C-alpha cells in the first residue's frame, strides 16, 4: 500500500 | 596484540574479575598498557573494553579496571551505532547513554572528562539527557558542567532534552538558569523541539521560565510548529501567553485544523472542520475591524478550490471528505508558504491515499505539486520520483491509461534531479559521497523506470518529442553509476535493481523498447563500463535467451544497427562473443557481426603484442585500444 | 473477563439482596469494566443494563438512608451516595462507549430515565448533568481514570436523550451550561466543548440564565472559545431581553407579572 511506504521518511 | 585485545574485550563483556586480571597482567606490561589504551573493531563497531564495560553495566570489571590499573577515560569509541553511526566517544558518553549512575560516577571521579569534544563536538551531557535519568545529569552538573556547547547539529543539551520525552532533565536544567532563549541550528529555542513530539509539560515549564516566542529559520513560531504537527494540547497552551495577537491565534487554529485533515497518526476530519470553523468564527465575530483571509489564487493540484473565506462555504464543505482534505492542503500551503519542509509531506500523503483508492488523476496532480515544491526548495526527491514510477506502474499494470504530459513532467524533474545529484556527488569529495552516489544510482534507476512506462503508453507527436527531448537532455550528460554503467548499460542489464514495489511488474530489464528509445535519442552505443564491457558485452551475457528471445533479439539488432562495434574487448581482453555465456547470443551476434579488415588487423596487432604506439594514426590508437 | 464479570455480578446481587452497602462493589465493578475497555475487548450489554439497574436501586437506597441518620452517618451516607452517583456516571460512560443492540440501548435509556427522574443531587447540588459536563468531577485513580473522562460529549447526550433537567441549578444557581463554558481545555478538547454546548442549547438550555451572583453563561466563561461558540448557538427572544432589562434596572417585578414569569425574571 502506498500510504505505508511513506512512514520511512514521515 | 589484536588477539589479546579481543580476549580482554570478551572478558570485559561478561564483567568477570579473575579472567580480566589474568589476561591483563604479567605478559608484556607495556602491551598491557597498550591494550587498556586501545580501541578495536568488534562486531563491525569501534569499541573499547573499558567503554563496553561502561556499556554493559557490569560493575566489578570497571571497578578493577579503574583501580587495579591506571586506565584513561579519554579512550575513543562510538557515541551511538544506531541512528547516529559516528565515532569519537569517551567512557562518559557510553556510561551516561546506557544509564548507569555509579559507573559514570566513578568514571568522572577517576578523571573528569565532562568537557569531552568528539568529532561532532558533542559532550557526554548529550548522552545524559538522551538517557533521561536524572542522577547522571545531576552528577555531571555537580562536576562543573559547561552548559554552552552546540553539537554538529548545533543543538544545546536543553534542545535534545526537550525533544525527547524526558522532562525531569529539562526541569533540572532550567532550575539553574539555563538558556531557554538560545537559538539552535535553524531557529529552535527548545520550544520548537518541545512542540514537535507533543510534550505539554516541557512546553509549560519553558513558558513558565520565559523561553520567549521567536520565529525559527523557516519563520515558524513554536505555536505554529505545534499547530503543524497536530498538537492540540501545545497549541492550547501557547495560545494563552498574554501576547499572541489575533492574526497569529487564528492562523494557528487554521493550521491545526488543516493539519488534522492530512496526517497518518492524527487523522480527524471532524476536528479539521471544527477547528477551521472555530477559526472562521473567530475571524467573523465583530463586524467592525473584521479580519479577512488572504486567499491565495487557486491551485490546480487541490482541484480548483479558492480557499474558504466565508462560513457559508465552510459549512457547505463540512460533510465532504475530499473538499475538506483539499481545504486542509490549501490552508497548510497558505499558512506555511510553499517553501517549508513540512508543507509537502501532507500533499504526498493525500496523493498516496488517493492512489490506494484507485484514484490516479488527482494523485498525479498532488504528487506533481509536491515534487515541484520540493524541487523549488532544492531537496532530495529521489524517493518522490520512485513513487511516481510505482504509481505509473500501477496505472499500467491495471490496464489504465497514463497522460503523456504527466510522464513528461516527471521525466523533466527526474532529469533535473539527476543533474543536481551529479553536482552533489562531484562537489562533495568524500565527506558523505557514499549516500550521494547511492541516491544518484537510485535516481538513474527511477529515470529508467519512467522511460519504461513512457515506452508502454501512447503519446502524441508533441508529447513524444518532448519526452524524447528530456531523454536526450539526460543522455547527453553522460550519467554513469558507481560501477560505470551508462544509462544504456542498465537498460540492457539483467542485474538492474528494479524496486520490489509495483515497479517490479511493469518495469523489466533488459528492455527492448527502452534500449531502442535511448539509442535513437542519442545514447553512445559504444559506451564503456569501468570494468571495460561495452553495451553489447552485457546483453550477450543474458541468462534467459530462449525464454526471452524477443528481448534478446531486438536489443542485439538495435545495438548493432545503431552503431555498436561487435568486436570490442573489455579490460580482460574479451570480445562480446568471448563474453557470451549463451549459445543463442553467440548465434545472434555472429548473424549480426559484420567483418572488416580493420578489425581483423587490429585483432592480429593486439594478439601478437605488436607495439603500435607512435606507429599508427592517433584515431586508430583507440581502435587498437579496444581490440 | 466473562467469568470475572459473572462472579462479580453474582456477588453484587447477593450483597444487594441482603440490603448492604454496595458503593464500593459498584465502584470496583466499574473499575473492572474500565480495565476491560482499556484492553479493547467486546463488551456485553445485559451485564451493563443489570448493573445500571443495580446502581439506580443503590442510589435510591442511599437517598433513603441519608434521609434520616446520625450526623457522622450523615457524612458517611453523603460520601457513599456521591460515590454511587459518580459510579453511575462511570457506568453511563462505559455504556455509551461500547456498542449495544436496540433493545439493550432501550433498557439502558430506561434505567438512566429512572435515575434522572429520581433527581439525585450531590453536596453542591450537581445533578447528573452538572457532573457529566464538569471537569472537576472526581475520577477514581484506578482504571476508571483511563476511559471515564469528564466533561464527556456522549454521557451528556445520553442524559439529554433520557431527559435530564437541562436548566437545573446548583446551590450557586449554575446551570449545566454555566459549567461547560468555564472548561479549561477549549482548544485542546474542541469536541466535548462543542458537542456539549451544541447539545445543551438544542435541548433547551437558557443561554442567558443568571446564577446566584447574576452571571450569564457567556459571562461565566473563562475562555474566549466558549464565548465564541456559545454566542453562535444562542437565540434571541424578547422575553429574554425584557426580563434582562427588568433585572438590570431593579424594577419591582413582585405580583406585577404572572407567577410563571416571576420565575423567568428570577434567572433571566
Swiss-Prot record, chain A:
It comes from the Eukaryota. It is found in: Golgi apparatus membrane. Belongs to the CASP family. May be involved in intra-Golgi retrograde transport. Homodimer; disulfide-linked. Interacts with GOLGA5. This is Protein CASP. It comes from Homo sapiens.
From Swiss-Prot, chain C:
Widely expressed. Highly expressed in testis. Weakly expressed in other tissues. ANK repeats lie at residues 124-168, 172-209. Substrate-recognition component of a Cul2-RING (CRL2) E3 ubiquitin-protein ligase complex of the DesCEND (destruction via C-end degrons) pathway, which recognizes a C-degron located at the extreme C terminus of target proteins, leading to their ubiquitination and degradation. The C-degron recognized by the DesCEND pathway is usually a motif of less than ten residues and can be present in full-length proteins, truncated proteins or proteolytically cleaved forms. This is Protein fem-1 homolog B. It is found in: Cytoplasm; Nucleus. It comes from Homo sapiens (Human). It comes from the Eukaryota. The gene is FEM1B. Component of a CRL2 E3 ubiquitin-protein ligase complex, also named ECS (Elongin BC-CUL2/5-SOCS-box protein) complex, composed of CUL2, Elongin BC (ELOB and ELOC), RBX1 and substrate-specific adapter FEM1B. Homooligomer. Interacts with PPM1F and PHTF1. Interacts with the death domain of FAS/TNFRSF6 and TNFRSF1A. Interacts with CHEK1. Interacts with NKX3-1. Belongs to the fem-1 family.
